[PDB]
Design a protein around this ligand. Structure first.
Ligand SMILES: O=C(O)[C@@H](CCCCCOP(=O)(O)O)OP(=O)(O)O
Ligand SMILES: O=C(O)[C@@H](CCCCCOP(=O)(O)O)OP(=O)(O)O
Ligand SMILES: O=C(O)[C@H](CCCCCOP(=O)(O)O)OP(=O)(O)O
Ligand SMILES: O=C(O)[C@H](CCCCCOP(=O)(O)O)OP(=O)(O)O
Ligand SMILES: [Cl-]
Ligand SMILES: [Cl-]
Ligand SMILES: [Mn+2]
Ligand SMILES: [Mn+2]
Ligand SMILES: [Mn+2]
Ligand SMILES: [Mn+2]
Lengths: 464, 464, 464, 464
């Protein structure tokens, strides 16, 4: 507590279910014997007690959904669909609310219909949500002289020492938040929110209230006429498949991911390990050591996985990822996520693509136009210029068009609020504007308008 | 923190939520100022702190689902569908696991297909799940001299004094458990688990291993031939309504229900309060005081609601509940849940049904054949004989056939586990057998086989 | 046959079915006592013998299809759909072949998808087919000094006296041809021919091989992207309703129409007379005498009907049609077909529309841009200039847009062959070109390219 | 003209049709040069004239329908669907009326639902309709001393010499009748007539009025509950495959079949000859000469075909038919139609089935229980006992159950009228009763009630 404005919620200590099979556990243990970068520093005994709680909770996802995503990703890898992946850089517990989740889900659906029209093929929707609670950091000490914030699964954003302690109760708190968010995403995607009808207003509102709305009006009108045409051919909402939005996050905290492993039914066709904390996960630029625990963990799980590829990447290391992560040559099992910087993508990506294409494997080539284009503003905000983001996707498209390969998708950090985090766009967000609503707990996100704008621009790239 | 086995949640960095419309505030305040029976006794300041946490979490359900349920219950009230409501008497945190939830979902789906076939009309599926964590009790002190267990939202089942203390942190643990369970229920109902074809093996397996399998073989074979006929006519899974299982519980703990209130938008007209802790809630036999807070709270929320009616119910009071809770005459808004005792239902129900029918309102008449047929066994277990349960439903049907009214559904306590809680059934569970697997935290449930057997027997009442 | 290169096919003289009800026959007899213009001159006893044959043949259409068309026409009349009506001016027995019917059905489907896209609402497809075998003539003696050709139901096109005799065996020959054609139309519309997929090639081929293809490329590409978008949203051929093409003709030869009357089941909701020689029929400019037999016949049948309205039309006579033909105020029961000439439509149509709108009845306003725009070429061909056809539809649209009424559809004479009958269009058909392929047995038709071109132009009118 | 009761058709203004691929011409010519049994005896020049008329009429069927039938028959051959083939022995021009056609369509639809339910797999519906106008005969001279009636495509049923003269104009009358009938069959199968719900009343009405209704009540009630179950699961009419009834007849008159040949396009690969007089045709017991024109003609066409096998069939000859007519091993291309006699089928069929099965080809085994069980009654009527018909199907099932092969279907002669043609059934039709309504132009058909009764009995054979 009453004195601290804090409530202490007992973690119920509940009986364990049967353990995972010994043979699978033996494999997992050999993989986890590998060194792991960027891990929280909490004591082993606390970590273990927390893992043990999560080993018996209801999963966030189920294997059959992961199998279905794999099938849709195989279609992307074969050039017959497009991948849209997007959401917060760092979800926080505090902003894990109905309006914020609804806003991000809306933004993703809005982008998807526009991309679908431009691509003339299905778009698979993967949210950075329901688990994106842990971040690697470049530096152990931040500008305030504090232990760095590592995301809500590890410590607190607040700039004080007690908040920055690594506390493994946050593993359980992460789980609760993830399942609560996922519960909402499921509810929303089979509500009126997912109806293609709603785009009429969403896009029109965007075209009406945007500077440069005149630039997007034609395509917005085309889409509208496309929708009215299908309605006119007798296609109603209940004639279409239910909207599917998948959950993803960076698999960083191995205590969480391993506690969330489950065995499948064998009603599909043989039991294997799935990470049921999400549908797909990726391995970040700072944790993709070829002989590290993160890559080895990804080898052992059945989920589709991605690896972020920065400007230090070589064609040979990229091929090694393909060999470790797609040993069975299953199209769409592996996504290689390009984040090079707009000035570097046209130079650095083609040798990588060429070498990987020659393996005979079919990966998804995904563009992350954001993580390679960050800088600090003169006013001291971590920011990104919209134009550089756009230009990297542009470059990404040119690389693939020149090679005859499939530009497979984008991976963007976005939010459905009117934040001021990225510079530029039609609103022309300036360095001084950043201060009004810089709400991210980590990287700057495209706001609701900027991310919509990006989708129209990417639709136009898809049209060539 | 982990060292104290607690999750720490800040409240100070929480605000601030838009105020209710003035009239909804006024009405909600007046509802909660009324006397309230069977409430937990925790300090008001701690309760307020917990409610403040719950006021901004993602809801368990959303308004559009509740509106859809209401449309489907209206069909039931009109005599064009049947209501199946079932699940645990008391959900425990301990058993809130994938296997237990899957078992209960499955048992409900299995009963529903049988009942659908027997009824020749759609069956609405409502689980007692994702929130059924609070129990009213007949006595303050149990047989051990301890303060009564009142469900995991209030205190612990363990038979020691400290565990039995009312603990408001259980409001938050209840929500985390509910949303995790709901998340899984949503996942399961759009997996292959909900496919009608899975019935062939489920029923076959029940018929082969039941000691009374020969009695149910004919109906099971008929259902199977009906399913194969559907499929032979060109009906696949993709041609059917995705399975819907709604969440319900007794709206008992007003601290929880009020914190889970949310205001709807402008897609019906007037903004309304929805209780988003569940789709539908009911008011128990011990908290249905006509001028008490529970009935008054029910008048303020938009959800479909039910009221349990025990053997001291009068036709006049039944009418008063109808007029207070269905004041706008909306079929399906109100369910009257009869739980009389098998020896009493034939005499007590008809005059109640006649008076209510004469008002011109259309309630759902739902039979709860469990809560009026409970006795203590020699061995000291709270138990129910299967035959009395079946007999109450039988008498309920006879009452309706005689009046020409709609027997609208059943409300049962069941589990997908092979427990030994209710006597009788084909397994002929004896007083001695009860000691083997008496797992319930409160009332005895029908086990897998008993639930299924009851569905078959009720299917025959529907065909008769 | 052997000497004449003619085969004589015996007309089988078969037992009669029960007659139509006496009360309906009494009404019909009073209606048919009215004078009828433009009738064949064959003897009464031959006419009667031929009518008696047709009174017991399988119908060409069935009542339930006519009821369905009525419902779709009601949607047109309320401004929520668009009517496309088109086909030969005069079907001949000789050209009643698989390729010619397929060609006309294709042209109608091609036009329909383009109009659907432009209108952003359903298009009802009504072919001039399976019965368009009788023509009124302006003159009894033609330029060759012969009795005028009156269509194959009456006499022969060939320029010799024996062929021009009115021969009521042609009534039976008409029936055989109608049912054979209708059989094919039904087969074609549930074949691959009706699939929206086929437009990709049809429109592209048209854009590629047309002069002025550059003018239509943008809209053709939009439509293509619209189709690919709906395919990308998971809409496959079997997700759409089967294509429906209705049959229509001018109800001219009352011996035919009356012999083709049938009584409905009364399983719909009361038996009445339907003309089962077609789904809808119209009354021509030369036979629409307010007190004549044609209008009175149309009063007695349940089919939707149309009346052609020429430049002599007054607002008051138009209202009289509405009163006789839509006495029960059933939207879409009556279509008023404007054929004024492009120089006259903007002047003559608005007073007619105003007066009819003020009756409270909801007629379909349909534009016939062809019959008011005919002239004789210097080379002696009956022809039409494409530009004048287009301009009349344009004017028709302006009249309705100025009044806030619904431009409801078009009625055009078209064929799926590369004929040279109408001047102009993108092919710039000249007066000397007419001689190459002037194949019509009466009015000049838009060829396959010209009619497609007209659809693109009308789509652009619909877009404003 | 009308004065001569003839329709006059010119042949000189007819040409000219594109020539067949050289090999198809060569093969067709060689097929027709072979000896042909049971042909009409008209002059070659008159036949040629009639064929020239038929060569340019709209076909009765189209290739894509025939390809679809073939896919559905392949399912039957694989043991995954059941074939119901039925209709008149001899369609007459006299009875080619809306009521008679509707009655036959209905009887087939009624039998099909019963059989579907009994089989638990789709039932393919093939009518003997729209072309079943030619009969082979055992003798040239009938019992009156007249030239035998050979069906309306050849001569007249009237018992006078002039009517019995072979008249090639009946080729054209046959086509006009066929396409009129097909047109109606298409209309009916997409009207409310084909709705499954109409079964409840049809079966109810049969069960109430049948003297043996109590015997069939249980199955009828079961089917009804299956239908209501479908509907309770959310399956409406719009969710189902539109009804398909295919047309078939004995390919007897080669003048007719060759004139109705049409060449397909490039949508399978190689252009092929389709007989577009029907979907599927069969070769009769009297024209199945292995080196005769009928078998050879069947080898040239793309349609699925059948061959009747009577009691003198050997396993070796059965194999030779299979290898000649299914040379590419395409399941469903060939149907072997067993018509042995009820006293013979159990002994004669098994060795035939074994030899054919050993070839590795997949034929459809179809039971014709009519044509081997015909006798002359005391009163002078060609008749069949119901019990012998049922018994042949029974024996046919026993043969297949013993071998583990698929009883693929039945081929029956039925009508939707209450005729008195076959003895027995629940009505217990006696020799004396036959005189009341003996309406068939050739073999005795099962009446409405007998057909339905047979469907119920065969449904029980399918369930056994
Ligand atoms: O739905 C239910 O589970 C009961 C409420 C629980 C009563 C527990 C009494 O236990 P005990 O204290 O008697 O042992 O419904 P009801 O309100 O009675 O209709
Ligand atoms: O399908 C059928 O109708 C028969 C062929 C007609 C035989 C008529 C004999 O009449 P009759 O001359 O003996 O009186 O099939 P089938 O070839 O025999 O299997
Ligand atoms: O998906 C992502 O958000 C990562 C970057 C997270 C690290 C944020 C801390 O940055 P810093 O402020 O500590 O430098 O992308 P990637 O770099 O692995 O591709
Ligand atoms: O639908 C139509 O084809 C009629 C015109 C048919 C008369 C053709 C003879 O013309 P002519 O060469 O004998 O003058 O349209 P409408 O004029 O009744 O509107
Ligand atoms: Cl168990
Ligand atoms: Cl009858
Ligand atoms: Mn980031
Ligand atoms: Mn209970
Ligand atoms: Mn004309
Ligand atoms: Mn026969």
């Amino acid at each position: 507590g009453a004195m601290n404005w804090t409530v202490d919620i007992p973690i119920d200590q509940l009986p364990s279910l049967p353990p995972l099979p010994t043979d699978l556990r033996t494999r997992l243990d050999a993989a986890l014997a590998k060194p792991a970068a960027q891990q929280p520093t909490w004591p082993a005994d606390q970590a273990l007690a927390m893992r043990t709680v999560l080993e018996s909770v209801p999963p966030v996802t189920v294997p059959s959904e992961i199998v279905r995503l794999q099938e849709q990703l195989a279609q992307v890898a074969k050039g017959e669909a497009f991948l849209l992946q997007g959401g917060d850089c760092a979800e926080t517990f505090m902003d894990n609310t109905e309006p914020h989740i609804r806003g991000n889900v809306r933004a993703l659906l809005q982008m998807a219909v526009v991309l679908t029209y431009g691509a003339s093929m299905p778009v698979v929707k993967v949210a950075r949500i329901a688990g994106q609670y842990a971040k690697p950091r470049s530096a152990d000490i931040d500008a305030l002289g504090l232990r760095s914030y590592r995301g809500d699964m590890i410590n607190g954003f607040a700039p004080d020492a007690a908040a920055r302690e690594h506390d493994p109760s946050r593993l359980v708190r992460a789980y609760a938040n993830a399942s609560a968010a996922m519960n909402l995403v499921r509810a929303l995607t089979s509500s009126g929110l997912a109806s293609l009808h709603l785009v009429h207003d969403w896009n029109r509102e965007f075209v009406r209230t945007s500077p440069a709305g005149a630039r997007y009006e034609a395509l917005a009108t085309e889409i509208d006429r496309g929708l009215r045409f299908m309605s006119a051919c007798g296609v109603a909402d209940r004639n279409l498949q239910t909207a599917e939005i998948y959950a993803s996050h960076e698999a960083l905290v191995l205590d969480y991911e391993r506690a969330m492993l489950r065995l499948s039914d064998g009603d599909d066709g043989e039991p294997q390990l799935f990470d049921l904390s999400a549908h797909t996960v990726w391995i970040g630029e700072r944790t993709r050591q070829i002989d590290g625990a993160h890559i080895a963990f990804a080898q052992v799980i059945a989920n589709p996985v991605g690896v972020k590829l920065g400007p230090n990447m070589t064609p040979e290391l990229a091929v090694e990822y393909v060999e470790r992560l797609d040993p069975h040559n299953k199209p769409g099992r592996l996504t290689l996520v390009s984040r090079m910087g707009n000035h570097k993508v046209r130079d650095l990506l083609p040798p990588i693509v060429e070498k990987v294409q020659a393996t005979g494997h079919q990966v998804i080539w995904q563009c992350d136009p954001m993580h390679g284009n960050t800088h600090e503003s003169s006013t001291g905000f971590k920011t990104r210029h919209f134009d550089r983001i756009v230009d990297e996707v542009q470059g990404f498209f040119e690389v693939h068009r020149a090679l005859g390969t499939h530009p497979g998708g984008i991976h963007v950090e976005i939010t459905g609020e009117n934040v001021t985090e990225c510079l530029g766009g039609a609103q022309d967000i300036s360095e001084t504007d950043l201060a009004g609503r810089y709400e991210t707990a980590c990287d700057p996100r495209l706001n609701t308008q900027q991310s919509l704008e990006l989708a129209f621009l990417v639709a136009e790239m898809l049209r060539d």
